[PDB]
Scaffold this active site. Structure first.
Site, PDB file in Angstrom:
ATOM      1  N   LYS A 148       0.843  -1.190   0.000  1.00  0.00           N
ATOM      2  CA  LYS A 148       0.000   0.000   0.000  1.00  0.00           C
ATOM      3  C   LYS A 148       0.884   1.249   0.000  1.00  0.00           C
ATOM      4  O   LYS A 148       0.645   2.203  -0.750  1.00  0.00           O
ATOM      5  CB  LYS A 148      -0.915   0.002   1.218  1.00  0.00           C
ATOM      6  CG  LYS A 148      -1.882   1.178   1.265  1.00  0.00           C
ATOM      7  CD  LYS A 148      -1.395   2.357   2.067  1.00  0.00           C
ATOM      8  CE  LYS A 148      -1.134   1.985   3.516  1.00  0.00           C
ATOM      9  NZ  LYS A 148      -1.013   3.180   4.383  1.00  0.00           N
ATOM     10  N   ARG A 161      -4.179  11.873   3.670  1.00  0.00           N
ATOM     11  CA  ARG A 161      -3.026  12.784   3.594  1.00  0.00           C
ATOM     12  C   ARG A 161      -2.158  12.524   2.391  1.00  0.00           C
ATOM     13  O   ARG A 161      -1.626  13.463   1.802  1.00  0.00           O
ATOM     14  CB  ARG A 161      -2.132  12.608   4.856  1.00  0.00           C
ATOM     15  CG  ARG A 161      -0.815  13.416   4.887  1.00  0.00           C
ATOM     16  CD  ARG A 161       0.133  12.913   5.975  1.00  0.00           C
ATOM     17  NE  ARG A 161       1.405  13.649   6.109  1.00  0.00           N
ATOM     18  CZ  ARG A 161       1.589  14.716   6.884  1.00  0.00           C
ATOM     19  NH1 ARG A 161       0.573  15.254   7.567  1.00  0.00           N
ATOM     20  NH2 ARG A 161       2.799  15.261   6.956  1.00  0.00           N
ATOM     21  N   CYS A 193      -4.837  13.623  11.054  1.00  0.00           N
ATOM     22  CA  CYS A 193      -4.622  12.186  10.845  1.00  0.00           C
ATOM     23  C   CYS A 193      -5.040  11.524  12.148  1.00  0.00           C
ATOM     24  O   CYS A 193      -4.595  11.962  13.218  1.00  0.00           O
ATOM     25  CB  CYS A 193      -3.160  11.945  10.585  1.00  0.00           C
ATOM     26  SG  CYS A 193      -2.630  10.222  10.559  1.00  0.00           S
ATOM     27  N   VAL A 205       2.394  19.142   7.136  1.00  0.00           N
ATOM     28  CA  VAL A 205       3.192  18.909   5.918  1.00  0.00           C
ATOM     29  C   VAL A 205       4.277  19.971   5.699  1.00  0.00           C
ATOM     30  O   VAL A 205       4.851  20.058   4.602  1.00  0.00           O
ATOM     31  CB  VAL A 205       2.312  18.748   4.653  1.00  0.00           C
ATOM     32  CG1 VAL A 205       1.352  17.576   4.811  1.00  0.00           C
ATOM     33  CG2 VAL A 205       1.553  20.024   4.320  1.00  0.00           C
ATOM     34  N   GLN A 220       7.421  20.149   6.287  1.00  0.00           N
ATOM     35  CA  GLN A 220       8.692  19.699   5.711  1.00  0.00           C
ATOM     36  C   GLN A 220       8.595  19.472   4.199  1.00  0.00           C
ATOM     37  O   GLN A 220       9.578  19.677   3.478  1.00  0.00           O
ATOM     38  CB  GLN A 220       9.203  18.442   6.415  1.00  0.00           C
ATOM     39  CG  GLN A 220       9.661  18.683   7.846  1.00  0.00           C
ATOM     40  CD  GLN A 220      11.039  19.331   7.919  1.00  0.00           C
ATOM     41  OE1 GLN A 220      12.013  18.814   7.363  1.00  0.00           O
ATOM     42  NE2 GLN A 220      11.128  20.455   8.612  1.00  0.00           N
ATOM     43  N   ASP A 278       4.337   0.859  11.650  1.00  0.00           N
ATOM     44  CA  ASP A 278       3.184   0.238  11.047  1.00  0.00           C
ATOM     45  C   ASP A 278       2.962  -1.240  11.465  1.00  0.00           C
ATOM     46  O   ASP A 278       1.941  -1.794  11.105  1.00  0.00           O
ATOM     47  CB  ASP A 278       3.204   0.377   9.525  1.00  0.00           C
ATOM     48  CG  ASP A 278       3.128   1.835   9.014  1.00  0.00           C
ATOM     49  OD1 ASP A 278       2.876   2.765   9.809  1.00  0.00           O
ATOM     50  OD2 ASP A 278       3.300   1.998   7.781  1.00  0.00           O
ATOM     51  N   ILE A 292       7.050   7.533  16.464  1.00  0.00           N
ATOM     52  CA  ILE A 292       6.766   8.096  15.146  1.00  0.00           C
ATOM     53  C   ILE A 292       5.452   8.873  15.079  1.00  0.00           C
ATOM     54  O   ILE A 292       5.352   9.872  14.354  1.00  0.00           O
ATOM     55  CB  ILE A 292       6.779   6.976  14.078  1.00  0.00           C
ATOM     56  CG1 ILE A 292       8.091   6.167  14.136  1.00  0.00           C
ATOM     57  CG2 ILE A 292       6.568   7.556  12.690  1.00  0.00           C
ATOM     58  CD1 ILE A 292       9.343   6.944  13.760  1.00  0.00           C
ATOM     59  N   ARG A 312      -8.291   0.028   3.950  1.00  0.00           N
ATOM     60  CA  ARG A 312      -7.300   0.976   3.478  1.00  0.00           C
ATOM     61  C   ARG A 312      -5.963   0.303   3.156  1.00  0.00           C
ATOM     62  O   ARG A 312      -5.219   0.815   2.318  1.00  0.00           O
ATOM     63  CB  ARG A 312      -7.075   2.080   4.506  1.00  0.00           C
ATOM     64  CG  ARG A 312      -8.306   2.938   4.736  1.00  0.00           C
ATOM     65  CD  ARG A 312      -8.007   4.146   5.593  1.00  0.00           C
ATOM     66  NE  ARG A 312      -7.078   5.035   4.908  1.00  0.00           N
ATOM     67  CZ  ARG A 312      -6.584   6.166   5.407  1.00  0.00           C
ATOM     68  NH1 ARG A 312      -6.924   6.586   6.616  1.00  0.00           N
ATOM     69  NH2 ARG A 312      -5.741   6.886   4.662  1.00  0.00           N
TER      70      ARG A 312
HETATM   71  C1  LIG Z   1      -2.709   9.729   8.807  1.00  0.00           C
HETATM   72  C2  LIG Z   1      -1.866  10.649   7.920  1.00  0.00           C
HETATM   73  O1  LIG Z   1      -4.108   9.790   8.421  1.00  0.00           O
HETATM   74  P1  LIG Z   1      -4.781   9.699   6.936  1.00  0.00           P
HETATM   75  O2  LIG Z   1      -3.983   8.766   6.107  1.00  0.00           O
HETATM   76  O3  LIG Z   1      -4.845  11.080   6.318  1.00  0.00           O
HETATM   77  O4  LIG Z   1      -6.162   9.182   7.286  1.00  0.00           O
HETATM   78  C3  LIG Z   1      -2.141   8.312   8.857  1.00  0.00           C
HETATM   79  O5  LIG Z   1      -2.895   7.376   9.208  1.00  0.00           O
HETATM   80  O6  LIG Z   1      -0.921   8.113   8.608  1.00  0.00           O
HETATM   81 NA    NA Z   2       1.822   5.491   4.834  1.00  0.00          NA
END
Ligand SMILES: *[C@](C)(OP(=O)(O)O)C(=O)O
Ligand code: NA
Ligand SMILES: *[C@](C)(OP(=O)(O)O)C(=O)O
Ligand code: NA
Ligand code: NA
Ligand code: NA
Ligand code: NA
Ligand code: NA
Ligand code: NA
Ligand code: NA
Ligand code: NA
Lengths: 420, 420
Positions: A24, A94, A118, A125, A127, A308, A330, A400
């Site tokens: 992903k 995002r 998020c 954002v 950076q 993750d 993170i 997702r």
């Molecule tokens: C954050 C950035 O949320 P989103 O992808 O915008 O729903 C994430 O889960 O990393």
């Molecule tokens: Na990601």
């Protein structure tokens, strides 16, 4: 799909094989990179995920002719007619911001809705914007949109990230690929999705040195062409299915993957007491019917333990032997699964970004609610080992990042049903 | 009401009066305390809020005969037939846990779903359970339910909160009121909703010393009777409407309130440059058409600056003169409004629980999304000062804590419409 739920009966020792899909987290920047291609481009091994569909929709909204069938996305930018990413899609994800760099670099213009919050607590954002300014971009942020412009090509420059940013590295790498001159990118993310993006850019004609390191050196080219490219395997999906073996005492072989993408995770599975066998493109975890030993970890940028995988390994630790220490560095709000695991009987104590899991012999089924992508898989893992029938609400989050999740788990013997 | 939105045109200097409703945060524990009453009990000045309706539903589900009409709740526990608080309501709001103490103390039994996550990042309910155990409760947490039991009455004991907990103080105060003997509660919350609860308990026949201090001393009684009681004014609603004057340069008088409930907040409004006038039960803030000075604050337990005003004052600071150092110490995830305010042009920099607001002269309308109760009012404030037409999505959160919010703001001249 806010109403979907999973109904799971725990207690099956899972056994079998799972084919790993494309990452992903690589598919999204690779899709954005298609904007750079001056001839048709094809991506294969693309997972059928909500985020992929959102970005395909966004790109189509630029006027790009784009098709997504099976695992294959084809795009032809000849019909592109705007550089606008609307609020309605960007608030969905995002990562929609990843079109900013290539639109600006190729067309000299990009207007992208400023990302809002998020769920798991992200940095702004800033950076990404600072990096683009280092290449000569003029950026206005107003009425909820980032307006980025440059006359002619961006100019090679010196980019340095003050904190590791995977998306910022991706955005700037795409932009630098078409800049006039040489760009140095320091403190670049080393996540292998960066390397995958860089390799596709190289296939398209880019000039990039320093792959797999924190210093990327890009020589801009006038134009990039299309190519055919296969998305790298999903290392997080890989770890997640191996964790399903670990938590249930079972044996799962993940195929179409690459153990070199997740050495830190594999080491932790070995520390749990699992037998981890592997080949160049496959891994098998056999937990031998044993209760895993609880293992401590600190999330850090690749090649260290990935954020993750945190929620998933926390779930395994919840039934593990002994106790373990967890530190999330993170994200700011990535313990949302903790209260839900606690409803199922887990013993987890949190203070800020530090958690301590004291493993319990058994979890008990209870209704729970998914809060984000990896939390949803963490709750699935807990439900797979819990005694009884767990209902997981808001399971849409799982879509997702995990295609065909019910089917893949059913193939391992899981008693899992989606109601929707 | 997930799809209700607000449509606001900013730029009106607000002027007028607002009648303050009963405190949401007092109504909930006062409703729970009705479980203790051995004769009919009536609460007045009850705000028509989602959380109030949820708790009325929960109490009715115990078999209590209960009516809620206008601002008045009437209850008769003669028909109570169970001590069960189901998942479906408890997942709706943590405060449903406030029935645990009185059910256990009066009936010797309570089964209450274990709360899951709180959007703004709350502590688990461990302190509530530890406190009840100090009074002799046996507590089993399994299948997602807290099962609390005791043979006969709870026994007076020594309760010590390791961290300030408003809900824990409320739960234990209700339980201690019917215990056999004397209970000391140390490090008790001093929030004035605790005092309001204590005063109603005293009106019902309880014996409680140490009101408005961190050490409550309760002499249990055999039974408590019904009474008629009026909920204390809402200090947070009060501060919120005064902030609407501050942010727009206007003049708002809040009636039916009590300035002694919010001295720390009033001092901050004076620091902004506002003229604050007051009487015994009313307050007026006149910002004199001036831009407020940005003011720093650190959220702390009452009587210091309240976390429940943080998001609102952050919004005022977003258009103020200078830097505001905002530090949140109570909740772990209570900056969810920051990215949304940033979409409207605010300049806010966050690191963990520390934020720095650099005031800007003007905000610009942009679509935003509410994330929680006080964030929704923060975005309303921002929309009231912003240039243009702001659409705020997910405004349903506001209905948890602001009765008749559109009407109250319209009475001040606001250009606000709910679409639903
Ligand atoms: C954050 C950035 O949320 P989103 O992808 O915008 O729903 C994430 O889960 O990393
Ligand atoms: Na990601
Ligand atoms: C937390 C506890 O969330 P909830 O009320 O349960 O939605 C809070 O906002 O304080
Ligand atoms: Na601007
Ligand atoms: Na946090
Ligand atoms: Na816990
Ligand atoms: Na509260
Ligand atoms: Na909830
Ligand atoms: Na238990
Ligand atoms: Na009486
Ligand atoms: Na900012």
């Amino acid at each position: 799909n806010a109403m979907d739920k999973f109904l799971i009966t725990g207690g099956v020792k899972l056994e079998g094989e799972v084919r790993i899909s494309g990452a992903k987290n690589a598919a999204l920047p690779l899709l954005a990179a298609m904007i750079l291609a001056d001839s048709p481009i094809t991506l294969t091994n693309v997972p059928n995920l909500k985020d992929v569909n959102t970005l395909v929709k966004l790109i189509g909204g630029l006027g790009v002719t784009i098709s997504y069938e099976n695992d294959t996305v084809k795009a032809d930018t000849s019909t592109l007619d705007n550089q606008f990413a609307p609020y309605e899609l960007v608030k969905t994800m995002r990562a929609s911001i990843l079109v900013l760099g290539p639109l600006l670099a190729r067309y000299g213009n990009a207007k992208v809705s400023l990302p809002g919050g998020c769920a798991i607590g992200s940095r702004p954002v800033d950076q990404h914007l600072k990096a683009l300014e280092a290449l000569g971009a003029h950026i206005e942020v107003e009425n909820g949109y980032v307006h980025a412009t440059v006359d002619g090509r961006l100019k090679g420059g010196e980019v340095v990230f003050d904190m590791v940013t995977v998306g910022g590295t991706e955005n700037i790498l795409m932009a630098a690929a078409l800049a006039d001159g040489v760009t140095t990118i320091r403190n670049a993310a080393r996540e292998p999705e960066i390397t995958d993006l860089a390799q596709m850019l190289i296939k398209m004609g880019a000039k990039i040195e320093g792959l797999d390191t924190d210093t990327l050196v890009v020589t801009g080219v006038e134009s990039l062409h299309g190519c055919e490219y296969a998305v790298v395997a999903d290392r997080i999906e890989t770890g997640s299915y191996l964790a399903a073996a670990a938590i249930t005492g079972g044996r799962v072989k993940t195929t179409h993957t690459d153990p070199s993408l997740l050495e830190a995770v594999l080491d932790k599975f070995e520390e749990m007491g699992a037998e981890v066998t592997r080949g160049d493109d496959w891994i098998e975890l056999d937990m031998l019917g044993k209760r895993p030993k609880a293992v401590s970890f600190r999330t850090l940028p690749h090649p260290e333990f990935p954020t993750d995988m945190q929620a998933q390994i926390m779930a395994v630790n919840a039934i593990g032997r002994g106790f373990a220490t967890i530190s999330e560095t993170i994200f700011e709000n990535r313990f949302m699964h903790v209260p839900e695991l606690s409803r199922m009987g887990a013993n987890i104590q949190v203070e800020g970004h530090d958690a301590v899991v004291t493993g319990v012999e058994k979890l008990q089924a209870a209704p729970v609610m998914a809060t984000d992508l990896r939390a949803s898989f963490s709750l699935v893992l807990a439900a797979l080992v819990a005694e009884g029938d767990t209902l997981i609400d808001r399971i849409y989050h799982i879509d997702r990042g995990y295609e065909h999740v019910e089917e893949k788990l059913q193939g391992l013997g899981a008693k899992i049903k989606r109601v929707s």
